[PDB]
Amino acid sequence: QGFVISNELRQQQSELTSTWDLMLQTRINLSRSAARMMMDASNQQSSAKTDLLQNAKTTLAQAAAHYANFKNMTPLPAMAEASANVDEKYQRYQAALAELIQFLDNGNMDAYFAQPTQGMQNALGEALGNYARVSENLYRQTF
Amino acid sequence: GFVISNELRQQQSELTSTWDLMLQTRINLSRSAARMMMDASNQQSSAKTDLLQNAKTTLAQAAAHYANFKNMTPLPAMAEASANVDEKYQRYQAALAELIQFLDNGNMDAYFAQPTQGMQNALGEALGNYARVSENLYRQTF
Ligand SMILES: N[C@@H](CC(=O)O)C(=O)O
Ligand SMILES: N[C@@H](CC(=O)O)C(=O)O
Numbered sequence: 001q002g003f004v005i006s007n008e009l010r011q012q013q014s015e016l017t018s019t020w021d022l023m024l025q026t027r028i029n030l031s032r033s034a035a036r037m038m039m040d041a042s043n044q045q046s047s048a049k050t051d052l053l054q055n056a057k058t059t060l061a062q063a064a065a066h067y068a069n070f071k072n073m074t075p076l077p078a079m080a081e082a083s084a085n086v087d088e089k090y091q092r093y094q095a096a097l098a099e100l101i102q103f104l105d106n107g108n109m110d111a112y113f114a115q116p117t118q119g120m121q122n123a124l125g126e127a128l129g130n131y132a133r134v135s136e137n138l139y140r141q142t143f
Numbered sequence: 144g145f146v147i148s149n150e151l152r153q154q155q156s157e158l159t160s161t162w163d164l165m166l167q168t169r170i171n172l173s174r175s176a177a178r179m180m181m182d183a184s185n186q187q188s189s190a191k192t193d194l195l196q197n198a199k200t201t202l203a204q205a206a207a208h209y210a211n212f213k214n215m216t217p218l219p220a221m222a223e224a225s226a227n228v229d230e231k232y233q234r235y236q237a238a239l240a241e242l243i244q245f246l247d248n249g250n251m252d253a254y255f256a257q258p259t260q261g262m263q264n265a266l267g268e269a270l271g272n273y274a275r276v277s278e279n280l281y282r283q284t285f
Pocket of ligand 2: 032035169173242254255256257258259260
C-alpha cells in the first residue's frame with residue numbers, strides 16, 4: 001500500500017484496463033464477423049465466419065469477469081463518484097455490445113450498422129479516463 | 144517521490160494510449176471494409192472512405208505517443224529487456240499501415256489474409272511484460 005493504498009488503486013486500474021481492452025476486441029470480433037458475412041450488395045464479402053461471432057461472446061464474458069473483480073475489492077469512499085459514473089457507463093457499453101451480438105446472431109444487419117456504438121464507447125473511455133485522474137490528481141496527496 | 148516511479152507511470156500512459164489507438168485503428172479499418180463490401184450509398188452513416196481516413200489518423204496519433212515513449216530514458220537494464228516492446232510495436236505498426244494500403248487500393252484478398260491478430264497479441268504480451276518488469280523489479284529497485 002502506501003500512497004493512499006497505492007496497490008489497491010493499482011489493481012483496480014489493472015482490472016479496468018483489461019475490461020476495457022477486452023470490450024474493444026469484442027467490437028473488433030463483431031466487425032470481422034460482419035465483414036465476412038456474405039449477404040450485402042454487389043459483392044460476396046468474405047469467408048463466412050460465425051466462429052468470430054462466438055469469439056465475441058467469449059471476450060465479452062471475459063470483460064465481464066474482470067469488471068466483476070473490479071467491483072469486489074476494498075472500495076475507497078473518495079472514489080465513490082468516479083466509480084458510479086464508471087457504472088452509468090460500463091452497463092451501457094456492455095449492453096450495446098450485446099444488442100450487437102444479438103443482431104449478428106439473427107441476421108439483423110438492419111440494426112447492426114445503424115447502432116451508435118462509437119458514442120457509447122467514448123462515453124466509457126471518458127469515465128475511465130476520469131477514474132484515472134481521480135486516483136492520482138489530488139489523490140497522490142498525503143504521504 | 145522518485146524520478147524512477149514517476150517516469151515509469153508516464154511511460155505506462157504513453158503505451159496505454161498507443162495500444163488503445165492501434166486497437167481503435169483496427170476497429171476503424173474493419174468498419175470500413177465491412178462498408179466496402181456492400182457500398183450502400185456512402186454518406187454520414189456509410190462513412191467508408193471517412194473510416195479509412197480516421198484509421199489513418201488514429202494510427203498517426205499512436206505513432207506520436209510512442210514517440211514520447213522512445214523520446215525518454217533513465218532506466219538501465221529495463222530498456223535492455225524492453226527492446227521487446229519496440230520490436231513488437233515496429234511489427235504491429237507495419238501490419239496496420241499495410242492493411243490501410245490494401246483497403247485503399249481495394250485489395251480485399253490481402254486485407255483478410257493478413258495474420259493481424261497474431262501480431263497484436265504479440266504486442267499485448269510485450270506490453271504486459273513491460274509492466275511485469277516495471278512493477279516491483281524497478282518499482283522497488285532504484
Ligand atoms: N455500428 C456498429 C457496426 C458498424 O457500424 O460497423 C459499430 O459501431 O461497431
Ligand atoms: N486480417 C485483418 C482483416 C480481417 O481479417 O478482418 C484483421 O484481422 O484485422
